[model samples]
Target: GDLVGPGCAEYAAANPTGPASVQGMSQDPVAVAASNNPELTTLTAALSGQLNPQVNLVDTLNSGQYTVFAPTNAAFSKLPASTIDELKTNSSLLTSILTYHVVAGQTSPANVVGTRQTLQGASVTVTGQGNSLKVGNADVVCGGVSTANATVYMIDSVLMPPA
Candidate 1:
């Protein structure tokens, strides 16, 4: 079996075929994998579980199979600074927002391209395919990213559930 790790550079350098199109390997949980991805830094920090009023998102995702539509740093960058600050100070608001991005079970592109309910108790519409896929109003930057217990679709916008 092929298990890639930090020292897997030698392997990557040697056999660069097959999964050439795929970037990075999934050897950790979703939260850990997000921390490793530079594009996901903002989302990672929010889900770190070390924050003062941290949501248990990391623990929940680590324990089961889920499909997380993770917003990239650019997504968070689009929001006003004040809005971001408010979310940080309001754990209830932050938790609801974070949970909105998660759906039960491991959903694939085929399974996801339709209406689905979020952990936040709201629904979102998914459409298109491949590079053109979208979830709610957010574009799917990359989909089908695997983790130990979850599947992630990195999105270009953060989803907001209804009040």
Candidate 2:
């Protein structure tokens, strides 16, 4: 077999309705889009165990007017086993976790350099300089990849709302 695998071009041709364009070698926008919200199917399913309840709560919400900070599957792996276990059983906490990720209205790279309220009701600051944007501490590595209904910005880690 090849060292890596199939290229994104090959993947995109296979995935018609999903994102095929990838920025970095491992950062596949299409795959990330499907990972965050997979009503369309890329790998994982809706209400899958990967995300907390609040993460799944996003699907029931209206589309558009929102920029989702979608975390990679790798990000999910970093969470402590205890935290993940707690989130699964605690629906309220999970919802808060997911809500903290949402911005009240439509947001883009241009308008994100300020403070905003999270779904969890805590405030987080966004700092943008040069050609980079960082949310709290999580750097948005996979920037500016979008779908028709939502704009998905890929980050390396999950945004944990303050206590």
The lDDT per prediction is 0.66, 0.48
Q: Write the per-residue lDDT of candidate 2 for residues 1-163, one digit (tens) a residue.
A: 1111122223344443324343221243223444533222311222233544334543432343445554444455577778766766566666555555555555656566678665457765766664566766765544444444444444446666787
Whole-model lDDT, model 1: 0.66
- Among residues 3 or more apart in sequence or in different chains, the pairs in candidate 1 whose N, CA or C atoms overlap within 3 Å are none
Candidate 2 error regions (>4 Å): 1-55
| TM-score of candidate 2 versus the correct structure, residues matched by position | 0.63
Instruction: For candidate 1, give the lDDT of residue 5.
Output: 23
- TM-score of model 1 vs. true structure: 0.79
- Maximum-TM-score candidate: 1
| Tens-digit lDDT track of model 1 for 5-117 | 22123334543433321234267777676556655657766766443254567777666787777776678889898888776666787777677777777777766888887
Stretches off by above 4 angstroms in model 1 are: 1-25, 50-52
Question: Judged by lDDT, which candidate is best?
Answer: 1
| All candidates: CA RMSD (Å) | 6.4, 7.7
